[PDB]
Amino acid sequence: PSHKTFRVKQKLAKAQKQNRPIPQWIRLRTGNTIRYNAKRRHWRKTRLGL
Amino acid sequence: GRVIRNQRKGRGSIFTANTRLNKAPAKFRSLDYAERHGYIRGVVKEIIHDPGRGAPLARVVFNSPYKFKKQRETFIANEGMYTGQFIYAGKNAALTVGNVLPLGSVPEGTVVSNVEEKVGDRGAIGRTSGNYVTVVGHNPEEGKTRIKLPSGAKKVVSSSARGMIGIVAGGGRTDKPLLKASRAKHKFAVKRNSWPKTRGVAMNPVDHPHGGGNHQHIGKASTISRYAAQGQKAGLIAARRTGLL
Amino acid sequence: TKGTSSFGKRHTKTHGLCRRCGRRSLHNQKKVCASCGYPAAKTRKYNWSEKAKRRKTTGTGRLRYLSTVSRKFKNGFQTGVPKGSKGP
Amino acid sequence: ASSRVTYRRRNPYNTTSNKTRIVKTPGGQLRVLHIKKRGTAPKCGDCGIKLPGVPALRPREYAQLSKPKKTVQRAYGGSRCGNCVRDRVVRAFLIEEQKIVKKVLKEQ
RNA sequence: GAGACCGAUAGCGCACAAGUAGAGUGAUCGAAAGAUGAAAAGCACUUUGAAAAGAGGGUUAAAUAGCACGUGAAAUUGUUGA
RNA sequence: UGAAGCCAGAGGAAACUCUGGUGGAGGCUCGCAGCGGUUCUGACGUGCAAAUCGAUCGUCAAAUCUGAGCAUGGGGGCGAA
RNA sequence: CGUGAGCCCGGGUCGAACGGCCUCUAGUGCAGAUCUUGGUGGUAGUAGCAAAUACUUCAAUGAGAACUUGAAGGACCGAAGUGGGGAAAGGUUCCAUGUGAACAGCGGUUGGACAUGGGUUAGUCGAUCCUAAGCCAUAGGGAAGUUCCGUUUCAAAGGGGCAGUGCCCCGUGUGGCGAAAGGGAAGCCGGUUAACAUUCCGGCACCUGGAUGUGGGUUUUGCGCGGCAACGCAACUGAACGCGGAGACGACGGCGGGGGCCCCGGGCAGAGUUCUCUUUUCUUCUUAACGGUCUAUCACCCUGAAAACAGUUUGUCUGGAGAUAGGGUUUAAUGGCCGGAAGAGCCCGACACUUCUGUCGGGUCCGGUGCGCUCUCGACGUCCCUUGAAAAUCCGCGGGAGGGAAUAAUUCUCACGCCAGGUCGUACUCAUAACCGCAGCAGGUCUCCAAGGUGAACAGCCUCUGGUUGAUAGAACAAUGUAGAUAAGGGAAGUCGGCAAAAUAGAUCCGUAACUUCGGGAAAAGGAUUGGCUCUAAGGGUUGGACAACCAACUUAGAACUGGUACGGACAGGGGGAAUCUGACUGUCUAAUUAAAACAUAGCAU
RNA sequence: AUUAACGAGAUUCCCACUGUCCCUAUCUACUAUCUAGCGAAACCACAGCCAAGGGAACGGGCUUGGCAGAAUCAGCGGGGAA
RNA sequence: AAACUUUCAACAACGGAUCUCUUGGUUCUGGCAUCGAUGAAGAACGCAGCGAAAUGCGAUAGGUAAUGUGAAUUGCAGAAUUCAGUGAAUCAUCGAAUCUUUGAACGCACAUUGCGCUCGCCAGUAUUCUGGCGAGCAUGCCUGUUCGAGCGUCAUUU
Ligand SMILES: [Mg+2]
Ligand SMILES: [Mg+2]
Ligand SMILES: [Mg+2]
Ligand SMILES: [Mg+2]
Ligand SMILES: [Mg+2]
Ligand SMILES: [Mg+2]
Ligand SMILES: [Mg+2]
Ligand SMILES: [Mg+2]
Ligand SMILES: [Mg+2]
Ligand SMILES: [Mg+2]
Ligand SMILES: [Mg+2]
Ligand SMILES: [Mg+2]
Ligand SMILES: [Mg+2]
Ligand SMILES: [Mg+2]
Ligand SMILES: [Mg+2]
Ligand SMILES: [Mg+2]
Ligand SMILES: [Mg+2]
Ligand SMILES: [Mg+2]
Ligand SMILES: [Mg+2]
Ligand SMILES: [Mg+2]
Ligand SMILES: [Mg+2]
Ligand SMILES: [Mg+2]
Ligand SMILES: [Mg+2]
Ligand SMILES: [Mg+2]
Ligand SMILES: [Mg+2]
Ligand SMILES: [Mg+2]
Ligand SMILES: [Mg+2]
Ligand SMILES: [Mg+2]
Ligand SMILES: [Mg+2]
Ligand SMILES: [Mg+2]
Ligand SMILES: [Mg+2]
Ligand SMILES: [Mg+2]
Ligand SMILES: [Mg+2]
Ligand SMILES: [Mg+2]
Ligand SMILES: [Mg+2]
Ligand SMILES: [Mg+2]
Ligand SMILES: [Mg+2]
Ligand SMILES: [Mg+2]
Ligand SMILES: [Mg+2]
Ligand SMILES: [Mg+2]
Ligand SMILES: [Mg+2]
Ligand SMILES: [Mg+2]
Ligand SMILES: [Mg+2]
Ligand SMILES: [Mg+2]
Ligand SMILES: [Mg+2]
Ligand SMILES: [Mg+2]
Ligand SMILES: [Mg+2]
Ligand SMILES: [Mg+2]
Ligand SMILES: [Mg+2]
Ligand SMILES: [Mg+2]
Ligand SMILES: [Mg+2]
Ligand SMILES: [Mg+2]
Ligand SMILES: [Mg+2]
Ligand SMILES: [Mg+2]
Ligand SMILES: [Mg+2]
Ligand SMILES: [Mg+2]
Ligand SMILES: [Mg+2]
Ligand SMILES: [Mg+2]
Ligand SMILES: [Mg+2]
Ligand SMILES: [Mg+2]
Ligand SMILES: [Mg+2]
């Protein structure tokens, strides 16, 4: 809601910075296995559970 | 079976009394030096309605004999009391309607209300609408007074027990049919959650001792022993007799 | 109408976030966590759930202080400086 | 055309604290102004009739008025009405006189 | 420190960003997923296409190893032949 | 639709009885929204839907409907059953 | 090769280990267990992608356009909306720029998708403060214990003054949490962004707290005057303690006042139509918080003393406990006027301009009506065996403690002047795509604002402001369907059964039975009328003395004329009667097969 | 036992009314139908023409006969003890 | 005859079996005894040149000090003065520190980044008001200190 309860608003800030794709330069690190962000979250797919 | 309805009433939480609209309880003022040897005077400020009671209450204001303050107190009004009336309470109070006197200083044959069984128990007997206590006789050798209760039972109380001269207000209340499920519903809505009652004979055997059967009937006698085991007392408990009187 | 129709009336949020365990299991009316049991001092866990203890046990976090205890013991809880270090 | 209006606060219900009146602004728009409850005139302590001479405001607003504006210049001021103050003067005098009469009768 | 143990549907649920992603109001439930090559040398350049890509051409011992990558069975499918 | 109460007029010896208004009572009545769910045993019945859709229907000033906060916890609760 | 389980060889692929023989060892041999896990078929390019009325033309973009965009036309929602806001819930879905794949069950150049950036500004809004139902500490008491009870008790419980201690005064009693819908200090208008606004900018205010100066007021027998009174004035001392008020309260009914909306005239401007007609159809003509000032129901005061009783409401109440009448005081503004404030906003016209979007001129008016709608206020009234929260907080009064000038003090409840107002939320959706239902699901989810016509009417139907034109499309028109319908003559012969459909239906007038608890039945049953046009009559207000003049909008009644005898012309809208069984009635339940005679109820009895 | 009023309660009859019926016919919209795109599921020992006989006493298979000619589209509800 | 259906082979598909491996598991054996009010385990939020996760760390934040080694890190420029360096590194060791909000969690609460009280310093005309900074204020129990209460009680004055 628009009434946010600052503790809750602090979790929402964490959730949107975490929802980013992986930098390109990580895919070239001489022994890398990381290929794509497997913890991607979308508001139409999965609930944050707050 | 399961726990029957009359067993669940002792736990509460839906069966507790509704008392939001009920303000201070109706009782005398604490027995003190003024009332023990003499009398004190109070003024009926206003007569009010107490939800779920049926008899009007009167808020009477006295003067504190020690502190320079007015002690509010809610009595149970008698038929005849009015706002601005002077109320006298004490051993030496005059015998008029609305005055609070010890039962030992009141002649036999009178009519009093809000009698107390024990000295200091500020009002126990005769507090509903049209009910009252009659003084049958005295016995000053040991200071005991024989009274008659609204139920018709005689009883002996201390001659120092107090009481209010007259008959409680609101008499004749139960002489008008309610005529409607609403009028019963509103009557009990301010008292507690006890309406309506499903018939036990219409229940299932899991729910009540009477439930079950291909016909609605009570299998055994409706008269239940005095010492039944808390879940068997679902009838006429310890009936000396039954049938039409 | 206990199915699809009744699920539309469901916007009340019985359980909220807990200060001690960070799970959405703090009952809002009872004010008691359903996971760590937090009105209380003693963390909630039972021996009839081996998985529940495993998820909550000592090796599952940062170990901000116990990770250093092992090294301190192995050197015998030293104090001081290594025999003439630079600067007082 | 359309002349409908909206609440200017986040309370969407027709509660007692959410009372509004419609105005027309200098810009030509119909708007709502959220209005507080109206005050209640102070009543007499004895009979309960509205006291003349004292305004009707909310309880906190009386702290803003000057002293003469909150009371009349009689004995019991803006607390009891004139008819009740007049009765108190007569009651005090008559009962005190009767007490003196009862007194001198007692010793004689 | 070892083994007459298991060897990626096995061995702990987890050989991997595993008590993770995800489900449930909650107590709790809980996976799948290893392997190019010795070395990225991970296909410059030309041409068709809007593009993905294709065809030449090049790297490599090998692309019948092209990141959908060691080998590549069967079920099932396409073309050719009988 | 029109209960008390109120106004005017008429009849009668009286008791009292009639007439016209006013008034606006009722767990009254027709009926829209809301609430419900009688029939078609209609549609659908690997559905729009793990119970919905259409017409028809019950109630509609109250024992009506309803939000949030709170209480009752499993041989326990709660139940116009 | 072997009877066989199997073994061996040749050919192709592949790139790092493996085999025979003798003993030892075992998690050692699969066709099944509605076996387990993973993968793949036929069915099959099949069922299907059919509720919510509906799209078409041109141009641009683009490789590509039914579902991108602009223009034009045609439509729908039709104010209890497909509109404008919010509460819960969601969490960046908001905005700009760009886009390969995947998603949008057809496409896609488009997107709530993907990628990169940006976006939420408060003393005045809300939380924060108070308490409610209730929850948890403390003192204590149980329990082996996790803990249970207890919330004022069988407790030595706390709160302030004066100069890190000293000295005083009171004490009945001594905690916290609990509402973004309850109580509550205080902000309005105009402008501004791609995205914020009672929050930014400009103007103009208000409240609280703290300091403190000037002016004014009071006082030389110390704490103001006026009025008969209701009370008034810019101030005009007031300690402990006590008293009172506000906060602070139901549902419904008609009535009166006010704001907004609707409606009708005239005027100034602009637009539409103009074969003909219409002095015509439509649109703008506005005034916030705040500071004053003048009025507005009740009520109260003074004079006076009423029957021939009077005053008086739609509603019958008031009056020797003082009415009518006359004169006054006062609570109540969302009322008039002034400031704010025309300098704003809006509407026209004339020129600038490369952009910056610039300049100038004119105007922004005056009335009426109403069982109209909505909100609100007020006085009455009805109902209750139903009487319809509490606390923080503020104020008044009683009381008279202390203090206070005659040369300066003093009320800092008067005016002005000074300083400060911390923390968190603030974007967006609020739903036939942003919530829950496995989903972009015909389901479900609280609330505010609510135009014109017809009409009794937030009934149905059509339209305006605003918003959509979204739901796979094209062509044919077989059977069988689903939905909507009509049928000659008969009229329930169909069927377990009039199931389904048809018929009746609004308003006005007439007429209305048995039975009855006398209240009903009853809209009983059953009849007649209804359009258009031209008239006539009745039902009012204001100012001047059964009159005259100037206004007003609806309702009812009567009569001619008229028509393919049609007229509640669509919409909307009771079928009825005679009985039997059962439950008195209103009400309730088996969410998702049973709504009933079952449950409940009032009444009766124990 | 009787009951006025009330009833989406059960029952019988009468009036009106009508496609329930005699006895069917016709019209409209959306499907079904054909096309472009998209595109499942249940089910499945192997399969899919009968008559009789016998048989676990009702066969698609066995025995004896009848017969029997690619590949298909729209309907249909006898059989597959579907 | 083609099409269609069925069978086989080559090639090409779908799928991930088989073979080989392995910074993993499992079992056994040997040694050791070390959490926390000096604030533990756990939780939340942050910190990198370019980072989402993992790992590490805490406003001194992919870390500082100290010691040892001795020339790196690496996906790109950035360190080339750090080349006698008096010293690189995502190194090892680790004895000094830092350690946000919480949590037994401790001023009262907490569904609030809410509400308080004491002391000291600084600024605003300020012992009282406002703001900034620092140090503090839980409960039970123990030993002692000091201030008290009770005709429980002793003696004296009186
Ligand atoms: Mg039963
Ligand atoms: Mg039993
Ligand atoms: Mg039965
Ligand atoms: Mg709910
Ligand atoms: Mg509020
Ligand atoms: Mg005044
Ligand atoms: Mg090779
Ligand atoms: Mg290879
Ligand atoms: Mg391969
Ligand atoms: Mg094969
Ligand atoms: Mg309805
Ligand atoms: Mg339905
Ligand atoms: Mg059906
Ligand atoms: Mg079907
Ligand atoms: Mg409620
Ligand atoms: Mg190799
Ligand atoms: Mg085995
Ligand atoms: Mg096998
Ligand atoms: Mg097998
Ligand atoms: Mg199987
Ligand atoms: Mg098809
Ligand atoms: Mg369909
Ligand atoms: Mg409405
Ligand atoms: Mg809304
Ligand atoms: Mg957008
Ligand atoms: Mg698509
Ligand atoms: Mg596509
Ligand atoms: Mg407790
Ligand atoms: Mg609170
Ligand atoms: Mg609040
Ligand atoms: Mg916006
Ligand atoms: Mg400003
Ligand atoms: Mg004066
Ligand atoms: Mg009050
Ligand atoms: Mg209230
Ligand atoms: Mg003005
Ligand atoms: Mg204001
Ligand atoms: Mg008068
Ligand atoms: Mg006003
Ligand atoms: Mg309303
Ligand atoms: Mg009233
Ligand atoms: Mg905002
Ligand atoms: Mg907003
Ligand atoms: Mg929004
Ligand atoms: Mg909305
Ligand atoms: Mg969803
Ligand atoms: Mg779910
Ligand atoms: Mg009309
Ligand atoms: Mg309408
Ligand atoms: Mg569709
Ligand atoms: Mg027949
Ligand atoms: Mg059911
Ligand atoms: Mg049913
Ligand atoms: Mg019954
Ligand atoms: Mg046969
Ligand atoms: Mg067969
Ligand atoms: Mg044979
Ligand atoms: Mg044969
Ligand atoms: Mg068949
Ligand atoms: Mg069929
Ligand atoms: Mg063969």
Quickly give B201 CA vs G605 C1' distance in Å: 17
CB atoms near residue D63 (< 10 Å): 8
Residues 6+ away with beta carbon under 8 Å from B242: B222, B223, B236
Vertex B82: Cα angle to B159 and B90 (nearest 5)? 25
Considering all CA atoms of chain B, what is the largest pairwise distance in Å, rounded to the nearest integer?
A: 74
**Which nucleotide is nearest, taking the CA of residue A6 and each C1'?**
G424
C44 vs C25: CA distance, rounded Å: 13
Give start and end residues of each alpha helix (H) in B69-189: 181-189
Cβ B69 vs Cβ B114: under 8 Å: no
Closest chain A residue to C26, measured at CA: A50
D83 vs D91: CA distance, rounded Å: 12
Ligand 6 center–CA D103 separation, angstroms = 44
Whether residue D53 is annotated as binding a ligand: the answer is yes
- Is C28 within 8 Å of chain A by CB? no
Residue with tokens 């007259």, as numbered in its chain: B166
Chains A and C make contact, 3+ CB pairs within 8 Å: yes
A16 vs A41: CA distance, rounded Å: 9
B231 vs A15: CA distance, rounded Å: 58
Ligand 8 center–CA C10 separation, angstroms = 58
Burial per residue of C48-76, b for 16 or more beta-carbon CB atoms within 10 angstroms, e otherwise? eeeeeeeeeeeeeeeeeeeeeeeeeeeee
**Resolution (Å) of this entry:** 2.7
- Kindly tell me the number of DSSP H helices and DSSP E strands found in chain A: 1, 0
B17 vs D40: CA distance, rounded Å: 34
B83 vs B48: CA distance, rounded Å: 10
CB atoms near residue D1 (< 10 Å): 2
Eight-class DSSP state of B113: E
Dig out the tokens for B235 from the structure: 């009838």
Query: Which method resolved this structure?
Result: cryo-EM
Interface test with C, best of A9, A47, A50 (most C CBs within 10 A): A50
Eight-class DSSP state of A12: H
